[PDB]
Design a binder for these strands. Structure first.
Lengths: 146, 257, 171
RNA sequence: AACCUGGUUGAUCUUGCCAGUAGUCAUAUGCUUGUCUCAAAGAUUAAGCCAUGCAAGUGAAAGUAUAUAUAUAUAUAUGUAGAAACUGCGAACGGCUCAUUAAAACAGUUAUAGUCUACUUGACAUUUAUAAGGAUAACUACGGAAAAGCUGUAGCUAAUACUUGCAUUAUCCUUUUGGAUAAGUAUUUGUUAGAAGGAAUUAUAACAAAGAAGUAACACGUAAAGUGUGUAUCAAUCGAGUUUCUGACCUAUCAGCUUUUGAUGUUAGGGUAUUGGCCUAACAUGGCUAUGACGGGUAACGGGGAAUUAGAGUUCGAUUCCGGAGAGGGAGCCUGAGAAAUAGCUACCACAUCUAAGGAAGGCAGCAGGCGCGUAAAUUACCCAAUUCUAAAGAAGAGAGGUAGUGACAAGAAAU
RNA sequence: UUUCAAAGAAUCAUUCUUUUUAAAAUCCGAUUUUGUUACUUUGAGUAA
RNA sequence: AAAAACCGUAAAUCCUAUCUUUUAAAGGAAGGAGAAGUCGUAACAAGGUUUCCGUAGGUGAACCUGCGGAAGGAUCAU
RNA sequence: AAUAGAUCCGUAACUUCGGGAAAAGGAUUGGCUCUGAGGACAUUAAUGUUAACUCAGAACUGAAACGGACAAGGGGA
């Protein structure tokens, strides 16, 4: 039920036989969800299960497209200032961020993401905290202070 | 090719070197030593532009040939030895000991030191590692590795290392009543007791230092130096005594001669 | 060979400068097969010699159930999650499935526990019958083309269930 | 130094532009030149071509010495020295130029919990010895071709070049001490526990395995035992490589781009020093876009900076320095820690040299000078005395660089 | 549109400083924490 | 060791198409300047038919007419 | 006389926007040995029974040749 690829997800280091699943406290002030701690998903690139260790910086953004498998797109709305006219002005850049299956992602929700070691061609970030934010209109159009 | 670089232009001489613009084209790049290049000076500069013992680099070389200069009570010969943040340099031909101190103005200055207190150097350990068979070693800013430290010593404490035996004597911790120097801060050269610390989650931690004139400033946790506890600064501070002197009333003092 | 000369994120193509610097490198592929033991040494960056195995025969192998290892030699290659060509050509890779002898492990079991640390683990009938056959499955774990030698762990439990179920509703 | 005047008209008030004006560290050019200080100077176009001369080697306690010479008590022992030579180390620094470069570089600001790291420094190690084996230079002797950084056989010999290789440490019971016991560092794989960081599959401990490279068969002399050379690991150092975030010239008469040739991602693997479509196989159909992508131009190396300022700004930024790229223009490659190096090599074309015609060797966008270009730019000078580099590190090299020369590029002082 | 205000010393006739006035966890009648961000004040990292 | 193959890096030559920049080209058709040239009364007054616009057709040219507008008109008005 | 089959890649001027167009112009093509995908049927998520030739890829091999004959546009301004 948990493996269906042409391979098996090993969950490195979790041990199988001696003892007395594996999960980490990640630190940084975020908490491990009970869903992640009592789930059955197996992954290598999961922030809370894999070999990664979040270090670097922390960003926040919106979900745009969750259609992929285990990857989502995060855009970073903010304001940019111009020295000539002395008025702030809008400017944005999106960034592909990996998602663990323990988190349910929906379009428009506010997500916090942390920096991780290069994981794909241009995916270098992993989601940590997700809060439910409803949307009206288009997620692409919608802008928030974050 | 793109190998390790081997020159430093005179304009690109480090900040505290105080070298003239037209006096040539290049400043010496210190060989890989016990301290960072950005925060240490070569003995050539130290004995030339401060001690004024010689007038040419080759004269300095002829001085260095005789085994007269000593660092940490042992012999050194290469003209590119960065002295480092804290140490003792001995000259036996005149039986004089110098110790590197800072100024409230942000530089390096040698300080005359008597023989008794010249045998004590103070080193802040930078890392604590564990080796095979449970032996704990400490790596200092001095580029020196001290094995078999007490379990008492923590990461930020300072250790009274002896120069000759290469062994520890005592530890000094970091309460709000411990004298601490600032290494490379923009307010470098201030001696204080530190009012308190401020630990930040996963970032730099900022510590507040209080002075003898009730002035309070803040500094990054990385570049502090435990120099002694509330009793006294254990080693001899320079003439300015490590208290930073305000600019206008400093001009007043300079004018009143 | 590593970091340029391909399209960008948005979909365009970047203009090319910065003639290839050597430290990108990208050494030519090395393919290790089954035969007589023979290895080569490669002058890796920083004078760190790297062992490139070209023909391997034997190495280390481990029971995870008892947490033990015993030297032996591989027999045949039967499956890999990667492309089918590497298992049809009898080569070795990091996460491949191969066939091993049973006699050294059986002799160790007899000398240790008797009968044909933390002992008394009750083993399993499915692996018991495979041992009775005498040629068993095992999954390689190390990288032969990196370490110059082979090592793997014998497959047990639902892992072997999945492997063998894909092996043989079956052809 | 927060500045205005002539010009539309028969005369007037306007909008409006032309012109006047002053600066440039902005160049050329015309005249003229009684001094001193100071000093820009073939970037503009031709990153076009080059005669010539040089531009990187290295020996003062310390590898190696019957090329070789001397000096001390009497073939005796030492020395003082030594070209030629093998080897170590640098030569991958510097200097020069800006054609390519438009989220690429660059700057600020992270991460490397995803790596490597020459010299040096500090701690410090594991499974025949009253001193081990060959293998060769310089050289001697026969040559050869025109020539070059050309070379065969014969004989040799050395070394810190190459290569074999001489114990012993730790732990438990009665409990100073008697007995018993264990013997692998990295690196790799499998199974457990587990001072620091914020979080480890961290440090480490135990077990099952594999397994490198060693631990001094090398030379000199200081306290009234020392140093040199070289070796395993850890750390720092002198750094480099990837890398997050934010930031740019004009243009829509470039609106839809990318995806069979990897486009975007998942799985697994090869590969690299680590990670990654870097690459391989399978699978998914995805990613960017009027917040201007994809395209095109730039008489575009980026930055701190320069010109002008009342303050806003606009324009120049090759150019003392930081970083990037390059050595004709692509491609490749050895050695070496570190080069995809060019005063290292290989191959093509375009050039071009010498040539006994058979064949050789080439890169001045290094310091000087020549041709060509154009309005446009300096001596084939002196010296490592100053700075600082290289090495076997005082005594030798250094067109890096300093001085001299030409110099109404500019700037300052001041006679008639 | 969602916390207003009141009170006291010190220059000259003003300005200025200082205390409290709800509810909820914290302390045996007192001891004391009660959004994010833009913004703004400060700092440290700030090559020459 | 020459030598040979293999996936691979890929120099260099040619063909094909496209793009970018200058240039030829018989003639054709514009604009400008020039000089007292030639033909007319078009416009400025009720400019001698008020002027102008949008559009279709015609004339040697300035122009004209038809249709619907505007007053910047020659009317601020039984 | 030149190819002409099939797959794949690419395809201009003009235009009544329907086409031109199979434009032009290219690449592959055999034998043997394999890999994968494409169905129906019955038992309490799992195990069995059974059927086409159709495509995509792979090594190996040959005097580098393979629409091997038979069959079949020469294009362009």
């Amino acid at each position: 039920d948990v493996q269906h690829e042409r391979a098996y997800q090993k969950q490195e280091g979790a041990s199988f036989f001696n003892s007395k699943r594996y999960w980490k406290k990640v630190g940084l002030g975020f908490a491990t969800p009970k869903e992640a701690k009592e789930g059955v998903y197996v992954d290598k690139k999961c922030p809370f299960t894999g070999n990664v260790s979040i270090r670097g910086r922390i960003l926040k953004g919106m979900v745009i497209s969750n259609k992929m498998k285990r990857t989502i797109i995060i855009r970073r709305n903010y304001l940019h200032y111009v020295k000539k006219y002395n008025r702030f002005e809008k400017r944005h850049k999106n960034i592909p961020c990996h998602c663990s299956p323990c988190f349910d992602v929906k379009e428009g929700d506010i997500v916090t993401v942390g920096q991780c070691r290069p994981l794909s061609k241009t995916v270098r970030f992993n989601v940590l905290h997700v809060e439910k934010h409803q949307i009206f209109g288009s997620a692409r159009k919608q802008f928030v202070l974050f | 090719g793109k190998g390790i670089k081997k020159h430093l232009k005179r304009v690109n001489a480090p900040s505290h070197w105080m070298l003239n613009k037209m006096g040539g084209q290049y400043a010496p790049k210190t060989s890989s030593g016990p301290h960072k290049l950005l925060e240490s000076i070569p003995l050539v500069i130290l004995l030339r532009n401060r001690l004024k013992y010689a007038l040419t680099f080759d004269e300095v070389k002829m001085i260095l040939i005789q085994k007269i200069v000593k660092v940490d009570n042992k012999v050194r010969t290469d003209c590119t030895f960065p002295v480092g943040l804290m140490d003792v340099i001995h000259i036996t031909k005149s039986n004089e000991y110098f110790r590197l101190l800072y100024d409230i103005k942000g530089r390096f200055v040698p300080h005359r030191i008597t023989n008794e207190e010249s045998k004590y150097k103070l080193c802040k350990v930078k890392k604590i590692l564990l080796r095979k068979g449970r032996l704990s070693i400490a790596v200092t800013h001095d580029g020196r590795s001290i094995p078999y430290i007490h379990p008492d010593v923590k990461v930020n404490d300072t250790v009274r290392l002896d120069l000759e035996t290469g062994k520890v004597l005592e530890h000094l911790k970091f309460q709000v009543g411990s004298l601490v120097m600032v290494t490379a801060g923009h307010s470098v050269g201030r001696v204080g007791v530190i009012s308190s610390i401020d630990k930040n989650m996963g970032t730099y931690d900022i510590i507040h230092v209080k002075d003898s004139r009730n002035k309070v400033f803040a500094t990054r946790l990385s570049n502090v130096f435990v120099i002694g506890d509330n009793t006294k600064p254990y080693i001899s501070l320079p003439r300015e005594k490590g208290i930073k002197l305000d600019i206008i009333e400093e001009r007043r003092n300079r004018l009143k001669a | 060979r590593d970091g340029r000369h391909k399209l960008r994120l948005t979909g365009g193509k970047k203009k090319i400068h910065k003639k290839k610097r050597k430290y990108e490198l990208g050494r030519p592929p090395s393919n290790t097969k089954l035969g007589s033991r023979q290895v080569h040494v490669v002058r890796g960056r920083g004078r760190n010699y790297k062992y490139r195995a070209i023909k391997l025969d034997s190495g280390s192998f481990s029971w995870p159930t008892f947490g033990i290892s015993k030297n032996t030699r591989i027999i045949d290659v039967v499956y890999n999650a990667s492309n089918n060509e590497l298992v049809r050509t009898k080569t070795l890779v990091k996460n491949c499935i191969v066939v091993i002898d049973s006699h050294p492990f059986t002799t160790w079991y007899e000398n240790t526990f008797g009968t044909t640390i933390g002992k008394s683990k009750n083993i399993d009938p499915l692996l018991l019958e495979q041992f009775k056959q005498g040629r068993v499955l095992a999954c390689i774990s190390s990288r032969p083309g990196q370490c110059g030698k082979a090592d793997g762990y014998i497959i047990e439990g639902d892992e072997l269930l999945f492997y063998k179920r894909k092996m043989d509703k079956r052809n």
